[PDB]
Structure formats: C-alpha cells, structure tokens
Amino acid sequence: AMGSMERASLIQKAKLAEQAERYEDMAAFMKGAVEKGEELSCEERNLLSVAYKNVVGGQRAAWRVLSSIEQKSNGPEVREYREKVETELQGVCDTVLGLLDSHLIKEAGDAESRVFYLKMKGDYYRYLAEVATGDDKKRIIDSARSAYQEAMDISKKEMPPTNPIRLGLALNFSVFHYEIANSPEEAISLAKTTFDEAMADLHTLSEDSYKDSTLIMQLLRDNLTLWT
Amino acid sequence: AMGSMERASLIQKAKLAEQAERYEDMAAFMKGAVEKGEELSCEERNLLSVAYKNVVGGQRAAWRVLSSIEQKSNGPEVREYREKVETELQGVCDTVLGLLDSHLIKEAGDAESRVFYLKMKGDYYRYLAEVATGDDKKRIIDSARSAYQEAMDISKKEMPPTNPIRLGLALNFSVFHYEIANSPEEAISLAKTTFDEAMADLHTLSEDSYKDSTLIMQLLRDNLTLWT
Amino acid sequence: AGSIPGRRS
Amino acid sequence: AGSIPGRRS
Ligand SMILES: *Cc1ccc(-n2c(Cl)nc3cc(OC)ccc32)cc1
Ligand SMILES: *Cc1ccc(-n2c(Cl)nc3cc(OC)ccc32)cc1
Ligand SMILES: [Cl-]
Ligand SMILES: [Cl-]
C-alpha cells in the first residue's frame, strides 16, 4: 500500500503519527518502511515496536472488556463482537509476525537487533496465546517460549546484565511464565535473578544508562512485589 | 455495510463498542442503525452523537498537532500528512451531515429531537470550518450559524431555560461565536444570558435535573471566566 | 474555550 | 503483572 512512498518519508510520517497519537497510521507507515527490504536502525526498530504495541494494546484492552461481558452473560451479539475484535487482533499479530519472518529476523546479525526482533516474536505469540483456546493454544505457547528462549540465550552471551533490551526481554519472558505458561515460580526466579545481576553491574554505567537500567529494574521489582 | 444486521443488534453492539472504547466501531454501528430508516429514540440519538464526537474529536486533536508542526516548519511530508488527516476528518463530518440530511432532520418533529439534530448539524459544520480556508470557509460558517440559529429559535419557544439540550446548544453556539465567527462579545452575551435564565429556573427542578442543569451551567461559567 | 464534552454515554 | 510499557518513543 505504501510502495510509492519513499522509505525516508514513511519514517518521517511514522514519527509525526506518533506525535499525533495516530498509532494505526504509525503502524502502516512502519510496515511500508519494513517492506522496502532494508534493515532497520535502532531508532526505526523502536518506531516499529511502539506502533504495533499501541495498536495491539488497544485491541487487547477491548477484547478483555468484551470477554468479561461475555463471561458475565454465560443474544449472540456479545460473542459476535468479541469474535470480531479477536479476529482483528489476530490479524495484527499475524502481520507483525509476518514482517519478522519476511525478512527482519533472518537478516538480523547483531545481538541488539536479533534479540529485539526475537523478543517481539515472543510478545506477539504471547498476545495470540492470550486469546487462544485449546491445543491451538499449546503450539502458540511453544512458539512464544521458543522465541523468548533464543533471545535469552543470545542476550546472556552477548549483552551486559544491565542492557535495557536484555532487561525488557527478561521482564516480558517472566510475564509469559506467570500469565501464559502457568509457571509462577519460574517467573519469580527469572525476575529475581535478572534484578540481582543487573544491580551488581550498575557500578559500570554512566548516569544516563543508570537511569534507563534502574527504571526497568523497578518494573521487575513491581512484578515481584505483586507475585510474592 | 451493516444492511444484514438487525437494528436492535446494531444498537446493542454500539453500546458494547462504547464500553470497549471502540468509537470507530460505535460510529459504524450507529450509522447502520440510522440507515434502517426508523427514527431514533433519545438514548439512540445520544449513542449516535457520542460515537461521532469521539471519532471526530480524535481527528481534530491530531489535525491540531500536525497543523502546529506544519506552521512551525514554515520536505512535503508534514503538509501531506496534515492533508490526509484533514480529508479523513472532512469525510467523517460529511458522513454525519449526510445522515442528518437523509433523513433524520426532516422526520424530527418533536422539539427535543429536532433541536438535538440541528445542534449536531451546527457542530459538524463548525468542525468543517475549523479546517476550512478562504471563501469556502464563509459558506461553511454560514451553514453552521444557520443550523444553530434554527435550533436556538425552537429551543427558546419549546424548552425551559434549564433544559440540558437547550443549555448545551447555547454553550456550543457561544463557542462558535467566539472561536469561528470572531464575535467574542456575542459569545459572552449568549453565555451570560443563558446562565442567568437557567439560574432563575432552577427552583422548578428535581434533585436529579438540578444536577444535570447546574453541571452544564458551570461549563458556561468556565467559558465566561476564560473570556472575561 | 470548551464545548459540550459529549464523549460519554 | 506488567510487561514493558513500550508505547512511547
Ligand atoms: C522491549 C523493550 C526493552 C527495553 C526498552 N527500553 C526502555 Cl523501557 N527504556 C529504554 C532505554 C533504552 O536506551 C538505550 C533502550 C531501551 C529501553 C523498551 C522496550
Ligand atoms: C449537546 C448536549 C447537550 C447536553 C448534554 N447533556 C449533558 Cl453534558 N448532560 C445531560 C443530561 C441529560 O439528562 C436528560 C440530557 C442531556 C445532557 C449532552 C450533549
Ligand atoms: Cl514456591
Ligand atoms: Cl466589550
């Protein structure tokens, strides 16, 4: 759809759309930018992730409202509308996963890009798992786990324990364990170990990096407070 | 688009969409309900208005962000994107005005329905005027004024001065005078007279009606505080 | 200057 | 339980 627009113009419009809180537009601009076929810089990866996380975040909030009403009712209208929203959400997740598979991940060789994209792949399978029912859920859950695990293996080998991508990956994988995989003890252990290893590495950081790492570390602490 | 769905189902889904904060869906459901050809009840008129006010409210906020960036810059991208949002906003306003013209207003005989729809017609021409440039602006402005004026004439003859529709019409017409017509003195006079006549009629109201009328009266006061 | 906030109900 | 709030920047 965006084939006639310059890559640089799509990126510029994605930034404008973010300022205007037009996240569907932002995601469409960034999809067009990915489909130009070039790798994405760090800033461009952030734009792609922010766009789709906002789009799917709105869909997830709406799905939860409708699912709650539907369960409180158990006419066809609530189920029909929940199903409509669910299909839209699944379509957005499939689109993101398609961009990762064609061809962002296979061209991502540096740890920062490859870990970032694999974390995204885990996240979007996780969002699919939130609405999945049955044995379909099982394979979707394994797909999320496998993506997160590969990202974790790379991040432990290639990034310091305070790296914000490494920290956010561990945070989200811990949420996967707690909320999706029914493994609260694994979630707690991962969050604790991540927090403790980051704490021990803070002395190496500049003031600005310290602010970034400690902010995410507090998110790990917030989850541990809720879980224990 | 909604021709195969029952009127009652469209109404039910509009209420669900409001709960899920899915305002574009809400507006599409209510457009389908209007296009069934039956008149709308009081509650249904509120659903129609809430849906479109949220949709166009998001567009207006985005247009203002982009217009501010565009003026601060004076490549083509900011103008192109502002124009895209502007065309979308104009399309939504045209859709609402089309529903009012085919055929909500012509079938609205009671004061409460006719005043409501004419106020809507003034509002959507006002939103068109906010983005219009030149002599196009002049005819659009006159269309807003004419709709508001007919609504005002009916409301003064047929509703008590505390009626919430009458009060909200006067509030919005005063904003039209202040922000669109460059008539701040008319805006102030209308807001003051409306507030004073409502105050003098509050003694007739029940507790619940008193709460409704005084809430809108405070909005009139808030504008007067800002304008004087 | 505020118009009617008709975004709820 | 909160995941990364990656809705800004
Ligand atoms: C998945 C994910 C992980 C981390 C971040 N994140 C946050 Cl929050 N703050 C950051 C600061 C950075 O500076 C280099 C990098 C990444 C950051 C977002 C998303
Ligand atoms: C255009 C417009 C005018 C008034 C209202 N409004 C508000 Cl705000 N609160 C209301 C309470 C009512 O109870 C009967 C009716 C209308 C009300 C909304 C929009
Ligand atoms: Cl335990
Ligand atoms: Cl004066």
Side-chain angles (χ1 to χ4, degrees), chain A residues 9 31 40 48 54 91 126 151 162 171 175 181-183 192 210 218:
Chain A
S9 297
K31 178 175 187 287
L40 302 192
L48 176 70
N54 271 281
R126 170 162 61 87
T162 48
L171 176 70
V175 168
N182 192 36
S183 301
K192 281 198 199 293
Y210 183 88
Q218 177 68 57

Side-chain angles (χ1 to χ4, degrees), chain B residues 1-71 73-134 137-210 212-228:
Chain B
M2 306 280 174
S4 67
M5 195 177 315
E6 288 277 17
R7 189 187 189 278
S9 297
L10 289 164
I11 296 295
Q12 180 177 180
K13 292 180 185 179
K15 294 174 186 177
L16 295 171
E18 182 176 20
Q19 288 183 75
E21 286 169 35
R22 296 265 298 196
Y23 295 102
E24 296 181 28
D25 285 354
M26 190 189 183
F29 292 138
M30 292 296 320
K31 178 175 187 287
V34 168
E35 291 171 349
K36 300 294 175 180
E38 301 281 17
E39 298 188 28
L40 302 192
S41 71
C42 180
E43 184 182 1
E44 295 163 355
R45 293 192 295 274
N46 280 325
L47 291 168
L48 176 70
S49 178
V50 164
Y52 278 107
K53 204 143 253 193
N54 271 281
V55 171
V56 82
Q59 296 170 317
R60 289 163 76 207
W63 185 93
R64 290 189 292 263
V65 166
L66 300 169
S67 185
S68 179
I69 298 166
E70 180 182 18
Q71 287 157 332
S73 69
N74 300 332
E77 286 85 356
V78 189
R79 173 190 60 78
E80 287 173 354
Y81 188 41
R82 188 269 302 158
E83 298 178 320
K84 175 191 174 178
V85 171
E86 180 173 305
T87 298
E88 193 190 287
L89 184 160
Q90 292 166 324
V92 177
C93 291
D94 290 344
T95 293
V96 175
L97 291 166
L99 295 174
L100 294 168
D101 198 49
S102 301
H103 300 272
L104 288 173
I105 288 171
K106 72 172 57 69
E107 297 293 352
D110 294 356
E112 43 194 2
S113 61
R114 187 168 190 85
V115 170
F116 192 97
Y117 291 138
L118 287 167
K119 176 184 169 184
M120 282 181 74
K121 182 174 180 172
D123 285 342
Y124 288 89
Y125 275 115
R126 170 162 61 87
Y127 306 153
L128 288 177
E130 289 179 338
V131 308
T133 46
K137 206 176 165 181
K138 280 179 175 168
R139 263 177 289 260
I140 291 171
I141 289 171
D142 206 61
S143 287
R145 179 208 56 73
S146 181
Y148 283 135
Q149 189 60 61
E150 183 185 341
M152 290 280 332
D153 295 346
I154 299 168
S155 73
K156 295 206 253 63
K157 284 179 169 217
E158 304 290 344
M159 302 159 148
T162 48
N163 179 281
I165 316 153
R166 177 169 171 184
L167 291 178
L169 164 66
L171 176 70
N172 284 9
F173 195 17
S174 74
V175 168
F176 167 82
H177 285 310
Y178 195 93
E179 288 183 2
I180 308 291
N182 192 36
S183 301
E185 287 175 334
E186 187 71 12
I188 290 160
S189 175
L190 175 56
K192 281 198 199 293
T193 288
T194 301
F195 182 100
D196 290 347
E197 298 156 25
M199 179 75 48
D201 189 66
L202 290 173
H203 70 91
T204 67
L205 302 182
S206 68
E207 181 173 76
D208 287 353
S209 295
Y210 183 88
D212 288 340
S213 297
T214 56
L215 174 157
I216 305 161
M217 272 180 80
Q218 177 68 57
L219 301 182
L220 287 161
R221 179 169 272 171
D222 291 337
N223 286 343
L224 286 166
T225 294
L226 167 70
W227 294 343
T228 56

Side-chain angles (χ1 to χ4, degrees), chain A residues 1-71 73-134 137-210 212-228:
Chain A
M2 306 280 174
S4 67
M5 195 177 315
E6 288 277 17
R7 189 187 189 278
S9 297
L10 289 164
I11 296 295
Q12 180 177 180
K13 292 180 185 179
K15 294 174 186 177
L16 295 171
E18 182 176 20
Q19 288 183 75
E21 286 169 35
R22 296 265 298 196
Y23 295 102
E24 296 181 28
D25 285 354
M26 190 189 183
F29 292 138
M30 292 296 320
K31 178 175 187 287
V34 168
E35 291 171 349
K36 300 294 175 180
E38 301 281 17
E39 298 188 28
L40 302 192
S41 71
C42 180
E43 184 182 1
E44 295 163 355
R45 293 192 295 274
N46 280 325
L47 291 168
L48 176 70
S49 178
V50 164
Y52 278 107
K53 204 143 253 193
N54 271 281
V55 171
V56 82
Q59 296 170 317
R60 289 163 76 207
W63 185 93
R64 290 189 292 263
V65 166
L66 300 169
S67 185
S68 179
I69 298 166
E70 180 182 18
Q71 287 157 332
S73 69
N74 300 332
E77 286 85 356
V78 189
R79 173 190 60 78
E80 287 173 354
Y81 188 41
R82 188 269 302 158
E83 298 178 320
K84 175 191 174 178
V85 171
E86 180 173 305
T87 298
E88 193 190 287
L89 184 160
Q90 292 166 324
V92 177
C93 291
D94 290 344
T95 293
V96 175
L97 291 166
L99 295 174
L100 294 168
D101 198 49
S102 301
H103 300 272
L104 288 173
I105 288 171
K106 72 172 57 69
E107 297 293 352
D110 294 356
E112 43 194 2
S113 61
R114 187 168 190 85
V115 170
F116 192 97
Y117 291 138
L118 287 167
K119 176 184 169 184
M120 282 181 74
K121 182 174 180 172
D123 285 342
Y124 288 89
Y125 275 115
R126 170 162 61 87
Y127 306 153
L128 288 177
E130 289 179 338
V131 308
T133 46
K137 206 176 165 181
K138 280 179 175 168
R139 263 177 289 260
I140 291 171
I141 289 171
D142 206 61
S143 287
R145 179 208 56 73
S146 181
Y148 283 135
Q149 189 60 61
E150 183 185 341
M152 290 280 332
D153 295 346
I154 299 168
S155 73
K156 295 206 253 63
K157 284 179 169 217
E158 304 290 344
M159 302 159 148
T162 48
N163 179 281
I165 316 153
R166 177 169 171 184
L167 291 178
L169 164 66
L171 176 70
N172 284 9
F173 195 17
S174 74
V175 168
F176 167 82
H177 285 310
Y178 195 93
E179 288 183 2
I180 308 291
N182 192 36
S183 301
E185 287 175 334
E186 187 71 12
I188 290 160
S189 175
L190 175 56
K192 281 198 199 293
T193 288
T194 301
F195 182 100
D196 290 347
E197 298 156 25
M199 179 75 48
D201 189 66
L202 290 173
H203 70 91
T204 67
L205 302 182
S206 68
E207 181 173 76
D208 287 353
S209 295
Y210 183 88
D212 288 340
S213 297
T214 56
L215 174 157
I216 305 161
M217 272 180 80
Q218 177 68 57
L219 301 182
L220 287 161
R221 179 169 272 171
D222 291 337
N223 286 343
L224 286 166
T225 294
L226 167 70
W227 294 343
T228 56

